[PDB]
Design a protein around this ligand. Sequence first.
Ligand SMILES: NC(=O)C1=CN([C@@H]2O[C@H](COP(=O)(O)OP(=O)(O)OC[C@H]3O[C@@H](n4cnc5c(N)ncnc54)[C@H](OP(=O)(O)O)[C@@H]3O)[C@@H](O)[C@H]2O)C=CC1
Ligand SMILES: CCCCCCCCCCCCO[C@@H]1O[C@H](CO)[C@@H](O[C@H]2O[C@H](CO)[C@@H](O)[C@H](O)[C@H]2O)[C@H](O)[C@H]1O
Ligand SMILES: C/C=C(/C)[C@H](O)[C@H](C)/C=C(C)/C=C/C/C(C)=C/Cc1[nH]c(OC)c(OC)c(=O)c1C
Ligand code: SF4
Ligand SMILES: [Zn+2]
Lengths: 156, 134, 342, 208, 95, 47, 146, 114
Amino acid sequence: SRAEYVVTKLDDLINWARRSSLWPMTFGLACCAVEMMHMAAPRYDMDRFGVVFRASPRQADVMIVAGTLTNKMAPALRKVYDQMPEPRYVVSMGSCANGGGYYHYSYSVVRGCDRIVPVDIYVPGCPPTAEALLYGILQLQRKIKREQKLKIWYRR
Amino acid sequence: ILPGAAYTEKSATYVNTEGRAQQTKVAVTPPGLAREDWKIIRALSEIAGITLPYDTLDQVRNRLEEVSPNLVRYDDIEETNYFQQASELAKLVNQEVLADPLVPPQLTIKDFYMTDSISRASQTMAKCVKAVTE
Amino acid sequence: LHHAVIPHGKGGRSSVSGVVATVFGATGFLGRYVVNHLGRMGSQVIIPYRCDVYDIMHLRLMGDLGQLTFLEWDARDKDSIRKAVQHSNVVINLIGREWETRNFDFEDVFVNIPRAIAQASKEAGVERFIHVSHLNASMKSSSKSLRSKAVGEKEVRSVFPEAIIIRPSDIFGREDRFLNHFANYRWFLAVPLVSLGFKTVKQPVYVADVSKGIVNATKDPDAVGKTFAFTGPNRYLLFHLVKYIFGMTHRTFIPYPLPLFVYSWIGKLFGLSPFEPWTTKDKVERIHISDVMPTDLPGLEDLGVQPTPLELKSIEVLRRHRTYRWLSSEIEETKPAKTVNY
Amino acid sequence: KRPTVRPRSDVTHKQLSAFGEYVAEILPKYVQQVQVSCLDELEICIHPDGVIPTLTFLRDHTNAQFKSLADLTAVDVPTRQNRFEIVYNLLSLRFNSRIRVKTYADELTPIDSIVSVHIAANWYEREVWDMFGVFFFNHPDLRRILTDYGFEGHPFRKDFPLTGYVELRYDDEVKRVVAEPVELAQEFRKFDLNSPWEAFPAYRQPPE
Amino acid sequence: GVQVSPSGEKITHTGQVYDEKDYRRVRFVDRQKEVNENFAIDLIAQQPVNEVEHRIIACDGGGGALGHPKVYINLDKETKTGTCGYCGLQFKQHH
Amino acid sequence: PTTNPPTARKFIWTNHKFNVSATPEQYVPYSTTRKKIHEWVPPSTPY
Amino acid sequence: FAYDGLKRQRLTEPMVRNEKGLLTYTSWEDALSRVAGMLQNFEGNAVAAIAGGLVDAEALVALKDLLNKVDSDNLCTEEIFPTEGAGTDLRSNYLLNTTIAGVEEADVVLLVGTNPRFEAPLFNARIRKSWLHNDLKVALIGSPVD
Amino acid sequence: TSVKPIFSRDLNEAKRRVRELYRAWYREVPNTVHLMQLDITVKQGRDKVREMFMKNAHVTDPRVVDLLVIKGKMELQETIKVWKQRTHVMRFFHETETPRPKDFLSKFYMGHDP
Ligand SMILES: NC(=O)C1=CN([C@@H]2O[C@H](COP(=O)(O)OP(=O)(O)OC[C@H]3O[C@@H](n4cnc5c(N)ncnc54)[C@H](OP(=O)(O)O)[C@@H]3O)[C@@H](O)[C@H]2O)C=CC1
Ligand SMILES: CCCCCCCCCCCCO[C@@H]1O[C@H](CO)[C@@H](O[C@H]2O[C@H](CO)[C@@H](O)[C@H](O)[C@H]2O)[C@H](O)[C@H]1O
Ligand SMILES: C/C=C(/C)[C@H](O)[C@H](C)/C=C(C)/C=C/C/C(C)=C/Cc1[nH]c(OC)c(OC)c(=O)c1C
Ligand code: SF4
Ligand SMILES: [Zn+2]
């Protein structure tokens, strides 16, 4: 119907604004965070996609888990994630974050950040190259593009 | 039917032809819902109201001790005497020997491969039987 | 048992529990507790969802790798219901609304959809069917939602004769619409209570117990075909409950009476909301329909769950309704409510 | 001249033997053994009572001046009664040399703390206590340093399992990170790698 | 080849396939079973037998250092071919 | 490749396939081995 | 090589007879509940047990204690051993008293009704070893097996 | 059987340090509960303190009681300074862990473990 069509284009409108402004939380754990700094470096310039690092979880949209999550740091990662306003997305980057990686069998490591927070995109690698992370970030925008919140509200 | 463990799947005591006591060890655990064989009878005993006085492998072997104490002397040959007594009780048996030739159940390697349940469930032993036969 | 469902492990996440449950309604308040209990013991859980994927994210971390299977379904399409209940040995129905929408009324949600699920579960060859209803479900009930629940119970048992029916009282928890509903009356200065809340009795139950007994019914041999009453261990007059809640939030309690017809008319205004109504006529009715006395029905304790008092767990629900001056006030600073044996 | 085998030197091994005798003559109350490896590294093995005096002399003596504590660590050898070997690696900038001082400990026999000698040791002794459970007397601030708060056990002890006993996950029912017994989807596979043939005749032990 | 089971699931080249009543089939609902369709067993059987004169022949798989370790096969048993234990190529003696 | 084409092989994919994640073509892991322990099948007749 | 029989024909689930007389999978609590129910009736001669060729001593003693607790003494084994004379009173009657390593010291072996090659393959190995090195004389009362 | 003491010369001189640690832990529950905004009562917290002290009721070697007291002071300090979090304090209460039955039959139904 006309209203169902209008709701669709309003859905694209709000998605587009969230796709075009992803503000990751300044937050990296280990060597994977070095490649996340390279994605911010001139060659890739994530800023040109509208991606701006913000220190405060209140001002951040995306949490990129870029390094190993140990048991000591697990509660703190969850707390800054809880304090992220919604909508909010997690990119798990690297083997350590993806599933433990080189430390999977360590007594002190969380075997994957997805035991602690819900993860949207998994980026393989140890570390993923800055392009691999960039591909993952741009794969998160397409996930948002497929969001259908307003349309589903209409059919409730 | 009560699914029990196999010898690879439990720590069990066996006594060989010399009388030497020796024990297996768990390699894998029993499949499916199978359970260790002495704990089924212990589980059974409690349901039926006549609970048996042992709840762990340690206590069951202590009970084996109370019966025949050489079943916990692992890897040990316990010398036995008193054969003269057994003979003196054997001279009184009035039963007499038949004339049947003494023919063992296994004459040839054909009958060797499949004797017990595990031998009979083996596809390798079936090949060996089929191999010597044909 | 098929060899892939025999339970192994020690009931941790990486264990196998032998339960393969399709939970219909896992995306709601009680759903996240049912999936978590199923998921933590190592159960395969199929989760049919109609909402946006964003709204099922909090469930993703409730099972080990592979133990959660999300499926898109439309309650109008039968073929999608079969698609989900096809591989289960138990199906749990938690579908429900506290209000009516354009596309689904109380009959749809509480009768047709449960019957559609039960009808497909019987054809698919599912051993257990757990259906949640209500304690005050009855055909002689004032509440329009509570009559449909009574019908739905019977439809479910016509097409799945051995269905297990769970009847919880009011469920209270972090995301409930029970203690957070009264704690939110503070925004309107005063607390309108029909008859001042002294005629209504309530025996609320903690959500984790409801969910822990629902999961215990997925494996209890002595549950097929029974109806259960899940209720708290304490009955309170609505007044004392609402007074206690404001004691737990340390807000100012100013109760005044309001005749049911004036209260029922207000609920109609809030029900015009195009979004999720703050209240409705049916929600106002249900708040004042008094809990039935428990007479001859197995309860929580028959499924191995000990009811949790409303006193142990209120502060985890109500601390966020406090101001800074009272955030740190401990459970003991609040006087407990007064119970009634009728 | 062999282009594959490490050059051997000569003078350094002779020098470190002379200083090893030097140290043993001066501290005969504490020194139990002195050796120099084929890598040319001097080791002093002392009675644990001698730790503070031994590192004090080696730090302040004029013909030593081992003023830097390169590091401090323990090795767990369960077959020994005193299963913890405490190792101090010291550096002399004056003489451009290095020296290893070793003592031992058990579970219930704490060592003295050298924080009065080398402030560098403060955190190193926290790490030994945390990872091996070796208590140090007179430590200004002895508390865990590397393990999670309220972590039970000493994970660098040889008998502590590699994956530990507990693991963490987020539990949405209670809304926090919880600890639970460890279960692994895939168990760590232990490989038996030792060859049954002897590789070094020079280290063969008598079969007595 | 890619046989299909009575349940309709494709059978992998290793012969695996979930039973009818195996619940683990639910992972493929609204998705697919990754199957590789070029069965190496079927492809290797298509190669012709190379004929050689000598009784002992070396196979390295081709490409020299890009193949497998070089081995030799006896060709005396003139009733079956000689098969490479690495690449599966077959050899037979000319006379 | 317009001047140095790759070597042709009969098993090389003719049709490329991009990242199929999130779609109905997505890979789903599973065990590629067959059952190991075979269970006893009871007789289908009375005794 | 017979261990591969441990992977076929395995009992993995308790089973009982349903109303058509067929074995059906059930639960441990269910299945034990049937056997206890029957065990509480019968006592004495009415309950008997047979032990097979692959039973552990921890299960023979367990099954012995259970049946002795309902008065029964019919604990039997498929193997036969003459119970006349001493019977199993004296261990020396039913054991290999010279041991397996004692074959290496004898100088005559008399075999009575047995094919050791197949009944005890490693005991026939120890005989031939003494036959080879110690020059053991060996005689066989029985069939002319190889 | 002669050994260097850590601090105490025998069990009685060590129990003095135990009761002094139990006092400190007892005084701190009402603060931990108040500052960490735990969802328990003081009585329930203090009972848990007592439960942990009785977990080691069989120890008799004086050196061992010295190292339990040493550890308990470290645990007390981690709590007073709020180095621990709700999650850490609440781990003592094992609230998410179903407890394994201690009877033979229940173990027998549940798996192979003793
Ligand atoms: N106080 C309580 O919570 C009590 C609850 N109950 C019963 O427990 C069950 C769940 O309670 P609660 O969890 O509070 O209910 P919720 O309000 O949490 O909604 C439950 C689920 O119903 C689903 N649902 C509702 N309508 C539809 C529909 N038309 N098609 C598909 N899915 C639908 C929702 O999915 P979506 O979110 O995508 O719509 C949601 O996941 C209900 O039967 C309720 O009546 C009984 C007694 C008390
Ligand atoms: C004459 C005036 C009389 C006073 C008015 C009568 C009282 C009617 C209003 C009662 C309170 C309304 O307060 C409303 O409570 C409902 C019930 O949970 C909450 O409802 C919603 O809250 C959040 C929002 O995401 C959800 O998580 C929740 O599940 C949903 O129910 C609203 O967030 C709150 O705003
Ligand atoms: C200011 C805004 C920006 C856009 C900047 O350009 C970039 C992108 C942000 C930076 C520099 C850091 C982003 C996240 C973060 C906190 C990383 C951890 C980190 N940071 C380090 O140094 C800074 C290290 O140094 C050795 C590390 O090891 C580690 C592990
Ligand atoms: S995955 Fe590799 S690069 Fe990334 S944090 Fe772990 S070890 Fe470092
Ligand atoms: Zn080859």
